[PDB]
Write a protein that binds this DNA or RNA. Sequence first.
RNA 1: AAGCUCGUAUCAGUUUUAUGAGGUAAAGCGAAAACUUUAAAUAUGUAAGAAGUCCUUGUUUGAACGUGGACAUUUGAAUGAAGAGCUUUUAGUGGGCCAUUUUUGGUAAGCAGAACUGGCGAUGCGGGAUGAACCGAACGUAGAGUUAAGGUGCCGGAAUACACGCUCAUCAGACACCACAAAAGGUGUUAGUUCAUCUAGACAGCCGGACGGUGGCCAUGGAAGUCGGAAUCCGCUAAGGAGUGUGUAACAACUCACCGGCCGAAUGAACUA
RNA 2: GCAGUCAAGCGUUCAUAGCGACAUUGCUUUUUGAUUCUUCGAUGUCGGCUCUUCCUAUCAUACCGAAGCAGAAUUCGGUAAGCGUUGGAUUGUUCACCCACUAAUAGGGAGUGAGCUGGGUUUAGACCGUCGUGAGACAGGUUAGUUUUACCCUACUGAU
Lengths: 199, 193, 25, 234, 171, 165, 96, 191
Amino acid sequence: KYTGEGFVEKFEDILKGFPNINDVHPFHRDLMDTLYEKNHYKISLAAISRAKSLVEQVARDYVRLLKFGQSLFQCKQLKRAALGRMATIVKKLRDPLAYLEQVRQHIGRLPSIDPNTRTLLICGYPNVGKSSFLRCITKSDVDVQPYAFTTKSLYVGHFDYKYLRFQAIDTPGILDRPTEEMNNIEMQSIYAIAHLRSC
Amino acid sequence: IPDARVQPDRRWFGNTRVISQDALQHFRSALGETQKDTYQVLLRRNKLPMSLLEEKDADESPKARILDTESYADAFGPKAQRKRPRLAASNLEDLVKATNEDITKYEEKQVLDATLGGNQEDKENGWTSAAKEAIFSKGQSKRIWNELYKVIDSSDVVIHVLDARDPLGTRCKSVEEYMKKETPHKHLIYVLN
Amino acid sequence: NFPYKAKILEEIEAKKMKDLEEREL
Amino acid sequence: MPRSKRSKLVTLAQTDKKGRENKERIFDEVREALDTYRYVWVLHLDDVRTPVLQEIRTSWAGSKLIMGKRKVLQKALGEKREEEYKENLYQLSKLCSGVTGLLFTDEDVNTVKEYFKSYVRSDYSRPNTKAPLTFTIPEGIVYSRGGQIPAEEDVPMIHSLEPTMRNKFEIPTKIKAGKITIDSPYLVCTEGEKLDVRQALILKQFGIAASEFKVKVSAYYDNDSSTVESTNIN
Amino acid sequence: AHFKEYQVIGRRLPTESVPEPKLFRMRIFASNEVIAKSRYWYFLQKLHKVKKASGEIVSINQINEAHPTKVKNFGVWVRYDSRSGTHNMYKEIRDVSRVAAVETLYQDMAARHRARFRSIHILKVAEIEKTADVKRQYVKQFLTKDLKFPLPHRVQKSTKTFSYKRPSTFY
Amino acid sequence: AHEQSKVKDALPTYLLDREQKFSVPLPKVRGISEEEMFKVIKTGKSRSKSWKRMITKHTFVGEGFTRRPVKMERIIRPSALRQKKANVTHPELGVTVFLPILAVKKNPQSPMYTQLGVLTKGTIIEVNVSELGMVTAGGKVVWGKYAQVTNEPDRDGCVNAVLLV
Amino acid sequence: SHRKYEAPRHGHLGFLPRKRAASIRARVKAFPKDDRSKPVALTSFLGYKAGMTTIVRDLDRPGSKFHKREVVEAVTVVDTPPVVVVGVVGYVETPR
Amino acid sequence: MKYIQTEQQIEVPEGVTVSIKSRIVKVVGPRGTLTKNLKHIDVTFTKVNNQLIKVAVHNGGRKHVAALRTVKSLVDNMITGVTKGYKYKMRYVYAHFPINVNIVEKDGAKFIEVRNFLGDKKIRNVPVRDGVTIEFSTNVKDEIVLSGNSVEDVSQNAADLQQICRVRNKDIRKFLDGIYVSHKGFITEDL
RNA sequence: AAGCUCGUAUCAGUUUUAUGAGGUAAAGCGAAAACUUUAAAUAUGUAAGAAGUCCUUGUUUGAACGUGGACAUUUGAAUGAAGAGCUUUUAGUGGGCCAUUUUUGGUAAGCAGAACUGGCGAUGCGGGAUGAACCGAACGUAGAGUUAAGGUGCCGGAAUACACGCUCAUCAGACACCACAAAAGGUGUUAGUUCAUCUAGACAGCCGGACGGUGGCCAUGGAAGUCGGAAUCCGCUAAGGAGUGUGUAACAACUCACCGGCCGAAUGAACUA
RNA sequence: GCAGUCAAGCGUUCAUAGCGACAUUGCUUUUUGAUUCUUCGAUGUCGGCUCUUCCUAUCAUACCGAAGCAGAAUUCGGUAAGCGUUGGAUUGUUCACCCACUAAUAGGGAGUGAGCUGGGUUUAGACCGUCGUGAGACAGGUUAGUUUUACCCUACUGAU
């Protein structure tokens, strides 16, 4: 019971932690689909859920079998069997956890873009030389040096105008290719443009 | 302590149950054609290879296993290789109209769920509704359910008593479906007390 | 690491003749 | 060997130790070249960049330049008369004085000696020599060349080089917004300085090739005449 | 015990089909005649199928050192059966006599490899004629020119329970 | 692997890049005595009667089983120890598959256990092999075949059998 | 079987044995650490506990909640007429 | 195997006079004097020469010969400290709160007093070991120089500053503040 | 045994001899290692005379032997001993664990059956600190000596004996061991084995070279040995990977592997105890 | 667990006669956190009131180390038993679980079988259910039902 409960607690922490990708705002949904594969994201959390259900089931089955144990040897074998079944359940979950740690580290760093507040995106080529529109119109650090993609993600700054709060978003940049041949970095810019009600 | 031996016999490496192809078409066609009358009851089930017979039809296929083409390591990480979205839209304007539909759907969903809540606003006043009383859990006790499963395991005919005032409320469908799966040979009867 | 390896080697290689020199008349 | 010993660190690289047979091959190639070619110069190339050596080696084709262990070349030519290979050859193995190359050739002695008098290419001011210049690293953001092309012509030194600048070079460097920076000008060496290791490592780091390289050629053995002429063009 | 070196010479019992069988000799280190003669019979069992009841002992003779007051470098060759198999060994023993070298080696096997006198097989003992042929540094360290070493921290054995001076570890 | 790197059953084109005496395998197994099979159950207010018996090993109980009334119930087969499926390993094909149990053919200890259908080590059970797709010559498809239970399911949880091909 | 609900000990084990004190006048088992640089002073005194009474105190405790506010305190009055010296005792410091 | 006799050589320079009686070593030279108690090592010294001293262990194990090179190197560090002298240079760096490092006489003794370390109101006191001189370079901003005849004292006091300004409960990838030894050298430079 | 019946020399918890035996698998030398010699037991069955042998002269080619006489007492191996089977008859006793050696079958591991032999019962004494199962030990009362098993720092009679090594344990060991936890882990120490390198310069250090096609192909915002997928070759060499890692947005730089200069003589690796 | 695989090693005499660490693969309820919101014979009576101590396999508090650890928080790990570790609701009881409070509501040993108590071993009353021809006994269920030191020794607490 205790080992099953421990595994279930870690899995519940994982499941209740990570955002539900189809319940977040469509901007964040498309951003998380760009950064992490949406299908991989959901598949990994589903593997966590399946592992949780299976570990619960193994615990229940082997608590019922131990109920009829007749000796310390048989009961020891039943406990070892249950614990090994949970172990092989977990070890089969090696790749989803490796994916999810990287996702968690990365998703916890992402900016706090609010789709609904007053926003204004900074498209085109603002960051040239020492100058950058986002470093000058708000407090924020954005790398600048002239190569094609010196920032690979959305950067947010904030300022106040007429006692109201504004956010300004620097997009990583776009190329003039067709949509079937643009990469995730500039899908970020395109999704930011298409979703955020901005100027 | 017995002398538990199993002799070398030819009988143990032979087939025990085979089903003719013609019998397979017969039973496969008969499975669909069967209808159940409520007054017929199952006295005894035929031992049949249902795995070869219960092949339903399907209009949609299972979604493909994506981990065979691109792995988690290829999807995201230090060694990620997924650089372009694998299902990029044809053009920008269809992307834009899809985005507008998604935003409209999401915001309408937020609006309709705002009709269910003011418990979110109760979190602004920081109280919580009272505990579930132990008296509304009574009957879900594990000893009671063990007793029921003994009664079912030991009965050939199972009477399900219903309150004529509100029968559907006092109908325990989970036990019915458990018996339909696990014990088809035990006979459910309703009695409208 | 025995120092007199070659000497005892040669001595016993000389003694391989007796196993085939004498046995036949 | 008894315990608590240093663990040999091995890695998984391709190239393997050469061994005894490579030295045997150098020995035999020197022998056959001695039998074939006429003039055998001994060339001192103590610190030579490989492109320089390959250009020298390809600025003639009908000759051969052989390097290798100094001891194996002195062996092949022979330490003394009792073990030499050709009459009066041990006066050459007494003249192998460091990184030594053997130039077997048929070209006239005048041609070879003028070529090795007049061949020069620039190199880094290798340590333990008189410094051929004096460069002071300017104050401010240090650039790749340290001011030897102007600031707008040079690019800033990589921030990842700052730990080396601060620890291995002992230059008092700062990081100001990702750029290595010294608050005051820093002189590395003065003209005439007997360079230490860190001075010459600093000069190489900025690509300062103010010094020059030329082949130090000592005596050559004339095969058929069976004598050695102590040419010396340092 | 304190060892002696024997030669033990034997042969199979004569037969009508063979008069004067071959005579076999081993140099054997043992405490006394009886152990040495049994040692002979055990080895002669192992070497080839000669039974003790089928043969005899034609001689047994103690072997002494030719120069029992000249320090030699001894190269001793040993196989044994401790504690989990069989082994070859080669030990240098700077010593005066073969029997003292052998006793020193038996003490060394008891000390390190934890093997009894019945587990140890002395294969060959040889006076290294040339000091350049010594291979072990712990013996080669006493062969150096003009060898001197102190005996620091002398402990004086006291026949008295009490002493009226604090003892000295001098010279 | 590094040094061995530096040192230097046909399939159709649709199956490349795809892969993942009549003696029984256990002729004699450990004998399980009746006092180890059966656990005595006392009844009465003083626990004075001891006729009811409870099987401590796993059992396959059939498809239309019902528990006979407790007053006439001697051999107790608890519902938890009733096994419906056993994962059978095919020796030739090398795969293990979770196959339903159809019958118990021979418990080596005694025919009383076979009648009771207990699953212990070495019991010959009949399994529904219809998944494996074995077809006999003559075109009939095999859906029932014997398998010997190769483990002790009482102390493993599951029933592990190997197929008698 | 372990203690079901952990509760702390009733009482103090360093105030044992809870026996009657051997004398009515409690001993001083430690005197303040002697500092020879300061002038000569007495480290204790003797008086008689007279009773208790109530004090209003004008509390000057900065950072407190009763800062600059009168607070009523209970106090103990010890009657202390002057004590008169009658002897000296010299103590040597020994390995026991 | 017990080495019959293993030796190391402590070379004394021209200006240095070392006195060793009962494994108490006094080293005197131009920059002062040092003394170390070596009575825990069973080791034997010998004046082979006015410019060389032989340190030796007779009949020693593998652990006992491990202490000859330590003893030789300790006497060597004494000699270099009493001629060249040891000079540890520490540089203190900060992000927002400027560290204020001053030298104050607290109670007849000498103290490095580190203030405002990451805005701490705590004052950090590091006692100056005897014979260590704490000097503040003016040519370079924010650098401390420690010098002395003993490498042990100078290095210990430098490490004491290094540790008194340890960053606690912060991500030391982002909080770079502290007092760091930059350069370990000799006072002279060049002889 | 109230007994008496011969005590006539009658046997044995033993060996030897002669013959079986599982004929094992090993002799070497066979026409061939496959039998036929040949050889020890694994460790136990039979037999070794004087109421036995020889001769006879009669019964059914025939040997089973009727009957009368001689052999004579080293009378038929060794060792030990004084003793009869019963004919007669009477008390207690039928309960039980342990170990060894075989032997059969075992499984999580214990083990379970058979056969024999010892120990305890009924039994003290010396030793194992202690004690059903261990080591020693022929129990009247004493004296003297000598010992067994175990010991000899002190408790404690007896060497803080001699001697050769090993070991330092931040809870050593003193202890049983084809016993378990036990297969391994350790920059503890010691002795070994095998292989390899070495004045054509070994190990460790600095110092230098570490190149040329070439930024190889594909990929893409970039990818130049070092995000990746596949090639992984040639040249020049003393040596130098279509690159061991740090690094760069890419390069740069550093690095190793690989050579070479200085130094000078032993060293490395895997294994065993 | 069963059935494989590989092979560091082992055997060795033949490395294919066989063993065989680590590593790994198949079997277990449907790849998109939906369900799998889901219960299935403990022949068991132990458990609470008070109170003490010990264990460390540490929940908290102290100090550390490692993490995308910015901060805040957290996770994992080390030394650590000095010091704490709750109020109630619940049902044969206890854990669970529930509610909350808390720094945390850690896990155990010796537990307190006639120190005090509740159910059960609860004995002769009775009722119902099952079985038995019956007397009766049980698959049950319900109910009512005396138990008594110390004044002895020791321990412990205090006192001569």
